[PDB]
Ligand binder design. Sequence first.
Ligand SMILES: *CC(=O)NCC1CCN(C(=O)C2(Oc3ccc(Cl)cc3)CCCC2)CC1
Ligand SMILES: *CC(=O)NCC1CCN(C(=O)C2(Oc3ccc(Cl)cc3)CCCC2)CC1
Ligand SMILES: [Cl-]
Ligand SMILES: [Cl-]
Ligand SMILES: [Mg+2]
Ligand SMILES: [Mg+2]
Ligand SMILES: [Mg+2]
Ligand SMILES: [Mg+2]
Lengths: 236, 236, 9, 9
Amino acid sequence: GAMGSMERASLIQKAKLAEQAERYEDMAAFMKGAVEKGEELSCEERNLLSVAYKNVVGGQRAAWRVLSSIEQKSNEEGSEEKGPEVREYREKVETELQGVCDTVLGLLDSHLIKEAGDAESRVFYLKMKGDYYRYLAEVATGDDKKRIIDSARSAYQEAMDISKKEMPPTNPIRLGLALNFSVFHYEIANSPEEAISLAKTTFDEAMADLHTLSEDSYKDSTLIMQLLRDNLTLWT
Amino acid sequence: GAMGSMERASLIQKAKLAEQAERYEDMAAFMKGAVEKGEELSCEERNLLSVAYKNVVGGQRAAWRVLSSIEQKSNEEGSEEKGPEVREYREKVETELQGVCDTVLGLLDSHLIKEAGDAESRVFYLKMKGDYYRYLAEVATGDDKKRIIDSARSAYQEAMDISKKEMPPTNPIRLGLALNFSVFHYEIANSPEEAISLAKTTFDEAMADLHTLSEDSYKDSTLIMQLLRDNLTLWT
Amino acid sequence: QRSTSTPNV
Amino acid sequence: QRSTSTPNV
Ligand SMILES: *CC(=O)NCC1CCN(C(=O)C2(Oc3ccc(Cl)cc3)CCCC2)CC1
Ligand SMILES: *CC(=O)NCC1CCN(C(=O)C2(Oc3ccc(Cl)cc3)CCCC2)CC1
Ligand SMILES: [Cl-]
Ligand SMILES: [Cl-]
Ligand SMILES: [Mg+2]
Ligand SMILES: [Mg+2]
Ligand SMILES: [Mg+2]
Ligand SMILES: [Mg+2]
C-alpha cells in the first residue's frame, strides 16, 4: 500500500540505511514494499528481508516472555489480585506478534515460495515459513497449537528433503535449517531425542565435508556447527 | 484519543509493565493517556513520563546521527551520486523525532507546567521543556534554529532560578538540570566557557553540602557529580 | 536457558 | 565523543 509509489531500487537502498540506523520496523516495511513489487529476490535481498523481520519479531518475543512470566506469577496461589491489566497487555503484545508472523507468512505464500525454483532460494523461504509458524507456536494454546505445530513441521520437512538432495552438508542454509528444526523438536514438539539426533548427525556430516571449503566458507560453516554443539551441551 | 476509554490507574500500571518489557513506544502512549486525564502527576508518575519519552527520542537521535553522517559523507567532493534516498530517509526520521518532541512540549504546555506549584514538580517540567527544545535544536537549521535555541535557554534559565532559590545544592533534580544546561551551553549554544564554569560551580557547591545527606541521597548526588566531572575532563 | 537458533545474517 | 547528559531515571 504505502510503498506503492516508491521505486524497488529505492526501497532496497532505504532498507540498507534502516539496517545501519537499527530502524528494523522501517527496514521491514521497506522490504515488504520491495517484495510486493512482484519480482523474485536476490540472495542479498532475501538476507535483508530476513534480518528486518527477525529483529522485529525478536523484540516482540522478548517482550511477550517478560509479560507472560509476570502473568504466570500473578496466577499462583497466594498472589494478590491486580485486575485484568497484565492479561490485557500480554494479549496486546501477542496480537502484534501474530500480526507480524502472518505478514511474513503472507509474503512467502504470495508469491515468494511458488516462484522460487532454485534450491538455495526455495530452502531459504521454506525455512522461513517453518520459523514464523514456530514463533506462532510459542504463543499458541489448545487445538490451534496442534495445527500450527503441524504447519511448522511440514515446512521444515520439505526444506530438509530439498536441502539433503541439492546442497552439500556444509552449506550454511542447510546447517541453519537443521539447527532451527532441532530447536523446533526440543522446544516446541516435545521431541528432545529427535532434536539431539538431528544436531549430532548434522554436525558429524558437516565435519566430514570441511576439507572441501575455502577459508571464508569454513568460517561460516564452523560457526553454525558450534551452535549445534552449544545446544547438544545444553541438552545433554 | 485512543486511551480515552482506559482508567488512569490502568494506564499507569501498563506503563510500568511496558518499562519491564522494554516497550518504550507503548510506555510513552500509556503515559500520554495518563497525562491527558487532566490530574497532576506524582513524582513516580513524572519519572515514568520522562523514562518513556527519553527512550523513544534517544532511539530517534541515535538513528538521525547515523543517517546525517552517511548524508554528510555523500555530499563531499569525490563522492558518487546516489540520488535522493539518503536525504529522504534522514528527513523521515527527523520529522518523526520532531513529532515526538512537539508531543512532549504539548503535554508540558497543556497543562503540566501551569498546574505545577511545588518547586520539585515545576523545576522537573521546566528542565524537560529545555531538554526537548535542545533535541529540536540538534536537528534545526538557520533562523528556525535561533528561536529554538532561545526557547531551550529560556526554559533552562527559569528552572535554574527556581532551583537555586528553593532546593539545596545536592538535590538530584537541581544537579541534573545543571548538568543538562551545561550540555546545552557546550553542544548547542557555542559557549564552552559557560559550560565549564557551570559544571565547576555546581560540582563544588554540591561537594560542600554532601555532609548533610543520608547514604541513599549521597549515592544519587555523587553519581551526578561524577558526570559533571566526566564532562569537565572531556572539555579540558 | 533456551536453545540457540540461527543468528541474524 | 558527545558530552554526557542526565541518565534515565
Ligand atoms: C542468500 C544467502 O545465501 N543467504 C544465506 C547466507 C548464509 C550464511 N550467512 C550468515 O549470516 C550465517 O548463517 C546463516 C545461515 C542460514 C541462514 Cl537462513 C541465515 C544465516 C550466520 C551464522 C554464520 C553465517 C549469510 C547469509
Ligand atoms: C519525582 C522525582 O523526584 N524524580 C527525580 C529523581 C532524581 C534522582 N533519580 C535518578 O534516577 C538519578 O538522577 C536524576 C536527576 C534528575 C532527573 Cl530529571 C532524573 C534523574 C539518575 C542519576 C542518579 C539519580 C530518580 C528520580
Ligand atoms: Cl493493553
Ligand atoms: Cl523515506
Ligand atoms: Mg495478601
Ligand atoms: Mg491471544
Ligand atoms: Mg567515481
Ligand atoms: Mg526537515
